[PDB]
Amino acid sequence: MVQAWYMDDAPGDPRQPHRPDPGRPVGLEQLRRLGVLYWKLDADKYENDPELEKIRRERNYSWMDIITICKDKLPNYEEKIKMFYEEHLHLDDEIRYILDGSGYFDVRDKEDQWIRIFMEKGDMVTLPAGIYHRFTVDEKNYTKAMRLFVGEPVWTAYNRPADHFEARGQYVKFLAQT
Ligand SMILES: [Fe+2]
Helix, strand or coil: CCEEEHHHCCCCCCCCCCCCCCCEEECHHHHCCHHHCCEEEEHHCCCCCCCCHHHHCCCCCCEEEEEEEEECCCCHHHHHHHHHHHCCCCCEEEEEEEEEEEEEEEEECCCEEEEEEEEEEEEEEECCCCCCCCEEECCCCEEEEEEEEECCCHHHHHCHHHCCCHHHHHHHHHHHHC
16 A cells, blocks of 8 residues: 555645545556556565565665664755755656655656655655656654665765756757657
8 A cells, every 4th residue: 555645636735635626545556657666664674684685686776775864863954855855857766765754755747747655664665767756754854764776876966957967968858859
């Protein structure tokens, strides 16, 4: 089971439950078609069960680590949180696993629709590259999740807009001509 809302027919007001009239919850299967993948494992069962590593092999993930979010335990909160706070696009994939804490991930559909997805402990989520997304969890102001990336940590130093790069940007222009 996955927790998410189809705000496509719901009011932008965050305070509201975003329950359309009639109301309709996100379709887990619908998102999978969108290219969204999620792993259900117990953080405690993750380390005790390298099986999660097996999933990495399928997604070609050689680098993995455990990251926790906290103002006091996460120096550089303003820039770090603001950097991923804004929605951006790029040719890189997004793999996040919530070992602990509560939060939600922002995803976009090809139909130009936005869905609010809630991330729970033990629930992992993957966002295909080339799709806009926004990660937030300020509601709890304390979330612990693992991140899986391939190659050198690009996030360490990256440009907001993916198109910013001629090679990673100019290439995108070719798609427009398609
Ligand atoms: Fe991203």
